[PDB]
Write a protein that binds this ligand. Structure first.
Ligand SMILES: CO[C@@H]1[C@@H](n2cc(-c3ccc(Cl)c(F)c3F)nn2)[C@@H](O)[C@@H](CO)O[C@@H]1Cc1cn([C@@H]2COC[C@@H]2F)nn1
Length: 138
């Protein structure tokens, strides 16, 4: 177990068939969780579960370029629960990130940042106890 925020290095960036696994537990009072796949200061892919946005639970995905947030992609399917252990898996595919939570497909996010081999850090932050963060090639 690790204390958030945590940066996982992705040396040489990401590549299709790379599977990133984040294990941890949602804190009881949780408000938010964030994963940030970074290319330098740009955020190629921000994955942001919000537990109470206007009293609704939503997943917000976006990209940050030149320090400006782009167009949000939102999903109301919400597989996280306060207090519960989770597994987020991010599968890098040629044209998108694919996310599954607790072994159920959640969403796909098309690559806006094209230079996958420069997406060299994953930030993990928010209302979680982080158990582990690793990757493998499938
Ligand atoms: C309030 O800040 C968030 C951003 N955010 C979250 C965290 C954050 C930090 C720490 C933790 Cl621990 C954690 F979980 C976290 F989510 N930091 N920045 C990010 O979620 C962003 C995504 O679009 O929305 C907001 C910022 C935003 C969005 N938009 C417009 C709205 O429509 C189009 C464009 F997007 N302008 N600004």
């Amino acid at each position: 177990p690790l204390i958030v925020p945590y940066n996982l290095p992705l040396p040489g960036g990401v590549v299709p068939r790379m599977l990133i696994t984040i294990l941890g537990t949602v804190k009881p009072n949780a408000n938010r969780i964030a994963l940030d796949f970074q290319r330098g200061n740009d955020v190629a892919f921000h994955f942001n579960p919000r537990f109470n946005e206007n009293n609704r639970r939503v997943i917000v995905c976006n990209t940050k370029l030149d320090n400006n947030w782009g167009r949000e992609e939102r999903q109301s399917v919400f597989p996280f629960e306060s207090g519960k252990p989770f597994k987020i898996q991010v599968l890098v595919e040629p044209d998108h990130f694919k996310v599954a939570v607790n072994d159920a497909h959640l969403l796909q996010y098309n690559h806006r940042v094209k230079k996958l081999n420069e997406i060299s850090k994953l930030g993990i932050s928010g209302d979680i106890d982080l158990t582990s963060a690793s990757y493998t090639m499938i």
